[PDB]
Amino acid sequence: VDREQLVQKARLAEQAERYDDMAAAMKNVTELNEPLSNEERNLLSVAYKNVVGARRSSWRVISSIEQKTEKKIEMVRAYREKIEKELEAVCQDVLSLLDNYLIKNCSETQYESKVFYLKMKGDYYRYLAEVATGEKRATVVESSEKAYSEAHEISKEHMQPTHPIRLGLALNYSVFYYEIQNAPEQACHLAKTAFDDAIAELDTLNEDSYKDSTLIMQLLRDNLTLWT
């Protein structure tokens, strides 16, 4: 199997809603040890987002059952812990791909890729933080903030305020402050600043991405409305 067939397999797996297969295919593509195209980047992200998302959804269901309820609670807690370990394994898989391939071999001028991958790194440490406790949680919360903040600095310097990757970073970084750090003022400032910076430079919208830009601006406004 060559790279073209692996990417085709990922596309087929996505259509069949077999996201474990999709992630394995795109992990294999990454492990060819060459950079990812924009499409390969998106396929990798979609794959792992859906894999981890199934675990996140299941974890929230079992955690809610654990709060609402002898050998029964022992099984509920053990099952939650089983799902937790699966979720953590998926996140560490992604983070290893990011740290050892994707961020590692980014060129100096590939600012969009660096922001994309650093945002992903922030995302997956944030998913770890959702289920972590104690000192383990403090470590992954710190790692999430470090990745988001570096992505934010790079995107501030090298990307237009309407660029959809910069806007989506602000969206998720603000969510990190609201949900993980319990810091609604900082979350609102991040979201409002990104929205305002985009609307002030509306003339920088690109023909190939203006739909994503304007939609993510609405998602930012949605969260600000919910939070204020």
Partner: peptide
């Protein structure tokens, strides 16, 4: 979930992005 719900790429139809966002 309040985070980015869709992939940022043109090959994903807008209708899909709107459904993921709502």
């Amino acid at each position: 979930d309040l985070s980015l719900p869709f992939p940022v790429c043109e090959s994903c139809p807008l209708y899909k992005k709107l459904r993921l966002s709502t």
